Design a binder for this molecule. Structure first.
Ligand SMILES: [Mg+2]
Ligand SMILES: [Mg+2]
Ligand SMILES: [Mg+2]
Ligand SMILES: [Mg+2]
Ligand SMILES: [Mg+2]
Ligand SMILES: [Mg+2]
Ligand SMILES: [Mg+2]
Ligand SMILES: [Mg+2]
Ligand SMILES: [Mg+2]
Ligand SMILES: [Mg+2]
Ligand SMILES: [Mg+2]
Ligand SMILES: [Mg+2]
Ligand SMILES: [Mg+2]
Ligand SMILES: [Mg+2]
Ligand SMILES: [Mg+2]
Ligand SMILES: [Mg+2]
Ligand SMILES: [Mg+2]
Ligand SMILES: [Mg+2]
Ligand SMILES: [Mg+2]
Ligand SMILES: [Mg+2]
Ligand SMILES: [Mg+2]
Ligand SMILES: [Mg+2]
Ligand SMILES: [Mg+2]
Ligand SMILES: [Mg+2]
Ligand SMILES: [Mg+2]
Ligand SMILES: [Mg+2]
Ligand SMILES: [Mg+2]
Ligand SMILES: [Mg+2]
Ligand SMILES: [Mg+2]
Ligand SMILES: [Mg+2]
Ligand SMILES: [Mg+2]
Ligand SMILES: [Mg+2]
Ligand SMILES: [Mg+2]
Ligand SMILES: [Mg+2]
Ligand SMILES: [Mg+2]
Ligand SMILES: [Mg+2]
Ligand SMILES: [Mg+2]
Ligand SMILES: [Mg+2]
Ligand SMILES: [Mg+2]
Ligand SMILES: [Mg+2]
Ligand SMILES: [Mg+2]
Ligand SMILES: [Mg+2]
Ligand SMILES: [Mg+2]
Ligand SMILES: [Mg+2]
Ligand SMILES: [Mg+2]
Ligand SMILES: [Mg+2]
Ligand SMILES: [Mg+2]
Ligand SMILES: [Mg+2]
Ligand SMILES: [Mg+2]
Ligand SMILES: [Mg+2]
Ligand SMILES: [Mg+2]
Ligand SMILES: [Mg+2]
Ligand SMILES: [Mg+2]
Ligand SMILES: [Mg+2]
Ligand SMILES: [Mg+2]
Ligand SMILES: [Mg+2]
Ligand SMILES: [Mg+2]
Ligand SMILES: [Mg+2]
Ligand SMILES: [Mg+2]
Ligand SMILES: [Mg+2]
Ligand SMILES: [Mg+2]
Ligand SMILES: [Mg+2]
Ligand SMILES: [Mg+2]
Ligand SMILES: [Mg+2]
Ligand SMILES: [Mg+2]
Ligand SMILES: [Mg+2]
Ligand SMILES: [Mg+2]
Ligand SMILES: [Mg+2]
Ligand SMILES: [Mg+2]
Ligand SMILES: [Mg+2]
Ligand SMILES: [Mg+2]
Ligand SMILES: [Mg+2]
Ligand SMILES: [Mg+2]
Ligand SMILES: [Mg+2]
Ligand SMILES: [Mg+2]
Ligand SMILES: [Mg+2]
Ligand SMILES: [Mg+2]
Ligand SMILES: [Mg+2]
Ligand SMILES: [Mg+2]
Ligand SMILES: [Mg+2]
Ligand SMILES: [Mg+2]
Ligand SMILES: [Mg+2]
Ligand SMILES: [Mg+2]
Ligand SMILES: [Mg+2]
Ligand SMILES: [Mg+2]
Ligand SMILES: [Mg+2]
Ligand SMILES: [Mg+2]
Ligand SMILES: [Mg+2]
Ligand SMILES: [Mg+2]
Ligand SMILES: [Mg+2]
Ligand SMILES: [Zn+2]
Lengths: 138, 124, 99, 99, 208, 83
RNA sequence: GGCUAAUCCCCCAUGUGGACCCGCCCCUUGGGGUGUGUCCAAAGGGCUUUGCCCGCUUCCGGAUGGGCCCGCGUCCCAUCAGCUAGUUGGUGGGGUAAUGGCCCACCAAGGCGACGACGGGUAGCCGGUCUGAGAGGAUGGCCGGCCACAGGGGCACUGAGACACGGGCCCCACUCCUACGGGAGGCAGCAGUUAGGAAUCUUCCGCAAUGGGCGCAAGCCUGACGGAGCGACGCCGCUUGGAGGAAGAAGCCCUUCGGGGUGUAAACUCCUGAACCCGGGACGAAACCCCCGACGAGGGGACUGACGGUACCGGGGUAAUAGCGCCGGCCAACUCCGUGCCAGCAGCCGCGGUAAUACGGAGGGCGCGAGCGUUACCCGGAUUCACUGGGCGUAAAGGGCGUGUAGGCGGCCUGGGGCGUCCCAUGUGAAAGACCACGGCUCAACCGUGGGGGAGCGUGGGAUACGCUCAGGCUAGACG
């Protein structure tokens, strides 16, 4: 069995971007869909869309990269420099509203699952709620 | 270790073990001498070091180094123990306070008199 | 507020008394994971109403005896013997790990 | 030496021999009543019970047998007297108790 | 008791001119003139490249010797400045400038820092009508720093204020030369002081 | 007996008292119930005595007994003044 | 053995009221009301003696203070794995202010344990304190809160309250008295003695303040306390001068013998005036008390100091303690001489067996400065027990392999619950400390006033993404 779908999706994205792929198929679920929506709104991925692979539902995450570079290693700069699951099964993480971290001095995001839905750090702070600290992205 | 493993067993604090059982944890400990001896040092050095076996007020029997150039210490004189080992003499884990109880300070010592315990001279 | 807990009646064998098992979740104070510990309270059953495997509420009471400071407030959910079987199996496992 | 707090100790002993005495009387009357209730003599047991209740309240008047300890003794006494009386009861006097 | 002894040897050891002699660190006699090298037998020898700790230490020493304080009050005032809101270096400099004796020197009542410390210590100085003999006394903005009328007849004070005619005073200060008054207008900023010291080096020194 | 008295909270040669409601059986500098004023004998400030009268009026209505000095200070702020 | 008083004790009466058995009602564990029956009260003293004051009795309530109970938290060893006979529960009883195996009799055979029982080791706990970027580690002296003990062990009496430090009984050890039969003791109260130890103070002053006990008050008591003394033990402030003064005295040091250094440092010129002398000289102190008004309010008045003639103000006035560590690298500061694997230094690396910047002295220098070093201990660095924040192919580390128990972890969709989770309100989080602001001692240390913050837990309300749970559904995992 697959034991952490959210971390699995994050790692699919991490590997796909580390080899500069165009898209990636992640097994589909509403919670993953919300995470992907937050990513697309924050500009980390070009986007995503529902798809069917051999009858089973999946999510095509279309990733984005920087421009091609000079000198040796012309591989473009990554847009998702870093992705890291935080609250994983076996050690769940919950933060209050004063405990919401500032990711990379604001240049990054923290995705929270809260009573009011899945938000970013800024969104949860302006909303004034805390919740499960899912992942850092920057 | 998993988090569950750390909940079940957890990290183990590391105990320190005192290098100096000059007991009661006291800074100094007075005693009576048994032997005043000259001992040969370890491999890389060569000299004649003046040490003293001591019976202590804590019921302990140790060996202490005699600092300075010359000492008035004898077989049955009382002395104070300061602590601190001598790298090149295995066995002596303690030092001797000079200028205390029988062990007069180093005569004609003019540079470092806090250590070696000698009074301030006069300049005519 | 007299404390009210919820547990499963795990032992019947006493007169006018039941042994209830009450669970409790809380985050570990350093490692943060949600750990689940349980405790057996002795509840006072005056009418012998409650039987083994029942899920009842327990209420803080004026002491009935030594180790007895709680009374069975009411029945919540009657007759789930799986938790009782878990307790019995855990206790039976003590036959090993001795010599 | 020779602190006059000694006086207190002296007084103490006095007070002891007072309290003791009173207390003993109470007990010797109480049994005297209960026995007669056990043997089916309503009037005599009632009379002794009234005397015992009076003695108990008088001991409560002083530092001997003060707050609700006296009510305890009176309650237990009247309970045992009325209960023991119910063997061909016939509450003859009817004074000590409420009808 | 602060440092008491030969001073211009510290003009030399720090390599920079620090006028704690008052005058004569102006006239060509400071011994920084025609002898800029440090004191001792090895003064005129080549200087080996100093480590980072050496640079930080010499900078902090330069500052402390300039203001003439002991290391104890120096470090305690530094911690005080570190706890306050604002840049630690500029706040530290302003607190050092707030010292009563340093203010007496800044107002030109004394020729040097040590002379100002003595004029304070002996009660010749007035603060808001009252006398203060504590050189470590801190002057708040708005306080009036004058000379007690008992000491107004003194020849040294009249000499110093005779030379103070036409001379200019710090922008965060002001004084009336005839009535011997004076006013600590505001705390001086980093620019207000011409101190030949890099305060960031002192901050980095106390980092360890 | 709950009382109203003074607790010396200054320093050596600098006495500063807290007018305080406390059980008489505790230390004079120990734990108290309510702090209902402060007294400064040297009178080094414009305000050297404050009371918060109505609280003292309450605690007197329930049976607190002030010290002669405490009663003096309470009357000085007019806890008893009834016109 | 005898006499005698009372706010000592007893009996009767009065029953506002209260207590108790039984009945009823409302509440719901023994809360409140009610009916009859039974039982229960008391003390006088003082004056300005016709009125008031100090008291006394029963009761309801308030307040403060406590008793008992419960959730949760509270060190090490598993080379401590089984523990348990009042032990677990019941009925009745005893005891208490009060629940209770708290104790007792009888009945049942239970209770606890790997979620650390039992055993052993260590240890008063907390507010806080030290350190640390923080998490965390360590600690709990002093001040404040709670606990426990009063030579060791047990026991009760008196009382609202003790199982009572300066109360009592008994056993035990010790010291003293002893007519040998028997007695008296209890500083872990303030000083002080002695022992032990590296080491920790005066057999001080005082009731003037603050607080306590008794008293109508006057007042008495108070080694609580307020002060003083001793000790650089800590913190803070201060002095040992300031300015002028030689391309630069002697001495000492090095030298390429030309000189360089100590160095404006000294001498010396002038000025200021630590100490000490002289005089004035406190705040802390206003009530209690007196008197007017009714011993109230209010108004006004007067007695009251240990510190101490100290602090402080005014006048006069002398240039008037410097020491300690270090100078090979870490680490800031270098040369000469002397010693030659000796004598010695040493935190680690390491120096010294003939030029030693590392030994010893000198000169000079660096660091601090009434301190400076040393030892011990705690944290730190140490991300070296790694939650933040580490690892296991060859460096320490994958268990010889499997089966599987407890436990940990759990695919997709919908819904109910709202336990975790989150939010709001509120209660609590004492004071001191910490933080911020203002202020009081000439400044600070110190202290006051005010403000802010705060994890956790209680209660009420709300949110439902995730975790959980319950119900239903699906087939991608699993099995067939
Ligand atoms: Mg050798
Ligand atoms: Mg049963
Ligand atoms: Mg029972
Ligand atoms: Mg078993
Ligand atoms: Mg008496
Ligand atoms: Mg009898
Ligand atoms: Mg009693
Ligand atoms: Mg700052
Ligand atoms: Mg300005
Ligand atoms: Mg630092
Ligand atoms: Mg008390
Ligand atoms: Mg009133
Ligand atoms: Mg007689
Ligand atoms: Mg007689
Ligand atoms: Mg008679
Ligand atoms: Mg009477
Ligand atoms: Mg009567
Ligand atoms: Mg009636
Ligand atoms: Mg009646
Ligand atoms: Mg037994
Ligand atoms: Mg039995
Ligand atoms: Mg039975
Ligand atoms: Mg019972
Ligand atoms: Mg458990
Ligand atoms: Mg112990
Ligand atoms: Mg800190
Ligand atoms: Mg602790
Ligand atoms: Mg303690
Ligand atoms: Mg003490
Ligand atoms: Mg004991
Ligand atoms: Mg005892
Ligand atoms: Mg009494
Ligand atoms: Mg009692
Ligand atoms: Mg006791
Ligand atoms: Mg005693
Ligand atoms: Mg006593
Ligand atoms: Mg006796
Ligand atoms: Mg001794
Ligand atoms: Mg003292
Ligand atoms: Mg008094
Ligand atoms: Mg008094
Ligand atoms: Mg009178
Ligand atoms: Mg006396
Ligand atoms: Mg005292
Ligand atoms: Mg000394
Ligand atoms: Mg100092
Ligand atoms: Mg020369
Ligand atoms: Mg000079
Ligand atoms: Mg003069
Ligand atoms: Mg006065
Ligand atoms: Mg006055
Ligand atoms: Mg009159
Ligand atoms: Mg009046
Ligand atoms: Mg008086
Ligand atoms: Mg006097
Ligand atoms: Mg003077
Ligand atoms: Mg001189
Ligand atoms: Mg160096
Ligand atoms: Mg050395
Ligand atoms: Mg030679
Ligand atoms: Mg040589
Ligand atoms: Mg050699
Ligand atoms: Mg050398
Ligand atoms: Mg060295
Ligand atoms: Mg040397
Ligand atoms: Mg020197
Ligand atoms: Mg020291
Ligand atoms: Mg360490
Ligand atoms: Mg660590
Ligand atoms: Mg660290
Ligand atoms: Mg290690
Ligand atoms: Mg880790
Ligand atoms: Mg490692
Ligand atoms: Mg190998
Ligand atoms: Mg290996
Ligand atoms: Mg293997
Ligand atoms: Mg192996
Ligand atoms: Mg399972
Ligand atoms: Mg799931
Ligand atoms: Mg589960
Ligand atoms: Mg909820
Ligand atoms: Mg709150
Ligand atoms: Mg606070
Ligand atoms: Mg405060
Ligand atoms: Mg001020
Ligand atoms: Mg809530
Ligand atoms: Mg909902
Ligand atoms: Mg749901
Ligand atoms: Mg299902
Ligand atoms: Mg199918
Ligand atoms: Zn100069």
């Amino acid at each position: 069995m697959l034991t952490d779908p959210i971390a699995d999706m994050l790692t699919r994205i991490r590997n796909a971007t580390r080899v500069y792929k165009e898209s990636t198929d992640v097994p589909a679920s509403r919670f993953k869909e919300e995470i992907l929506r937050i990513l697309a709104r924050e500009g980390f991925i070009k986007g995503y869309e529902r798809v069917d692979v051999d009858g089973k539902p999946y999510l095509r995450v279309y990733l984005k990269y920087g421009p091609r570079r000079q000198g040796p290693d012309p591989r473009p700069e990554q847009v998702i420099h870093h992705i890291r699951r935080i609250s994983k099964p076996g050690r769940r993480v919950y933060v209050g509203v004063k405990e919401i971290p500032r990711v990379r001095r604001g240049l990054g995001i923290a995705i929270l699952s809260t009573s009011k839905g899945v938000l970013t750090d800024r969104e949860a702070r302006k909303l004034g709620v805390g919740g499960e600290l899912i992942c850092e992205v920057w | 270790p998993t988090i569950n493993q750390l909940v079940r067993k957890g990290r183990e604090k590391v105990r320190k073990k005192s290098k100096v059982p000059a007991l009661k944890g006291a800074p100094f400990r007075r005693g009576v001498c048994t032997v005043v001896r000259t001992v040969t040092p370890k491999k890389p050095n060569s000299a004649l070091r003046k040490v003293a076996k001591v019976r202590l007020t804590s019921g302990y029997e140790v060996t202490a180094y005699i600092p300075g150039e010359g000492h008035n210490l004898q077989e049955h004189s009382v002395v104070l123990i300061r602590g601190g080992r001598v790298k090149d003499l295995p066995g002596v884990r303690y030092h001797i306070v000079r200028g205390v109880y029988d062990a007069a300070g180093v005569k004609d010592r003019k540079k470092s008199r806090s250590k070696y315990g000698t009074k301030k001279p006069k300049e005519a | 507020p007299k404390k009210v807990l919820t547990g499963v009646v795990v032992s019947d064998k006493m007169q006018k008394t039941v042994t209830v098992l009450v669970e409790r979740q809380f985050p570990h104070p350093l490692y943060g994971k949600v750990i689940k510990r349980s405790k057996k309270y002795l509840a006072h059953d005056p009418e012998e109403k409650y039987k083994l495997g029942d899920v009842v509420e327990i209420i803080e009471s004026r002491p009935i005896s030594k180790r007895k400071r709680f009374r069975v407030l009411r029945l919540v959910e009657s007759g789930r013997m799986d938790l009782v079987e878990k307790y019995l199996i855990r206790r039976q496992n003590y036959q090993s790990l001795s010599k | 030496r020779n602190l006059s707090a000694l006086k207190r100790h002296r007084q103490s002993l006095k007070r002891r021999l007072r309290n003791k005495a009173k207390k003993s009387a109470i007990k010797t009357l109480s049994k005297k009543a209960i026995q007669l209730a056990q043997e089916g003599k309503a009037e005599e047991a009632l009379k002794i019970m009234r005397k015992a209740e009076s003695l108990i309240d008088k001991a409560a008047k002083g530092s001997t047998l003060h707050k609700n300890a006296a009510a305890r003794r009176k309650s237990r006494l009247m309970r045992k007297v009325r209960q023991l009386l119910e063997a061909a009861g016939a509450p003859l006097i009817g004074g000590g108790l409420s009808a | 008791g602060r440092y008491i002894g030969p001073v211009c040897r510290l003009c030399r050891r720090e390599g920079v001119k620090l006028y704690l002699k008052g005058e004569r660190c102006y006239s060509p006699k400071c011994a920084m003139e025609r002898r800029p090298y440090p004191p001792g037998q090895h003064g005129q020898k080549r200087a080996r490249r100093p480590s980072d700790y050496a640079v930080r230490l010499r900078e902090k020493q330069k500052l402390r010797r300039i203001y003439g304080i002991s290391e104890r009050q120096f470090r305690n005032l530094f911690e005080e400045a570190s706890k306050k809101k604002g840049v630690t270096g500029s706040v530290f400099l302003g607190l050092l400038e707030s010292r009563l004796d340093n203010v007496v020197y800044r107002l030109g009542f004394a020729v040097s820092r040590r002379q100002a410390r003595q004029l304070v210590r002996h009660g010749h100085i007035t603060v808001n009508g009252r006398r203060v003999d504590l050189p470590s006394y801190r002057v708040r903005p708005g306080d009036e720093i004058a000379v007690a009328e008992k000491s107004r007849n003194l020849e040294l004070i009249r000499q110093n204020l005779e030379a103070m005619k036409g001379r200019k005073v710090g922008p965060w200060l002001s004084l009336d030369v005839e009535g011997m008054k004076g006013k600590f207008l505001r705390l001086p900023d980093r620019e207000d002081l011409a101190l030949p010291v890099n305060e960031q080096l002192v901050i980095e020194f106390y980092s360890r | 007996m709950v009382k109203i008295r003074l607790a010396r909270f200054g320093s050596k040669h600098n006495p500063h008292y807290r007018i305080v409601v406390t059980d008489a059986r505790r230390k004079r500098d120990g734990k108290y119930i309510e702090k209902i004023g402060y007294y400064d004998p040297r009178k080094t400030t414009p305000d050297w005595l404050k009371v918060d009268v109505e609280r003292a009026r309450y605690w007197l209505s329930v049976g607190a007994q002030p010290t002669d000095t405490a009663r003096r200070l309470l009357r000085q702020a007019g806890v008893f003044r009834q016109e």
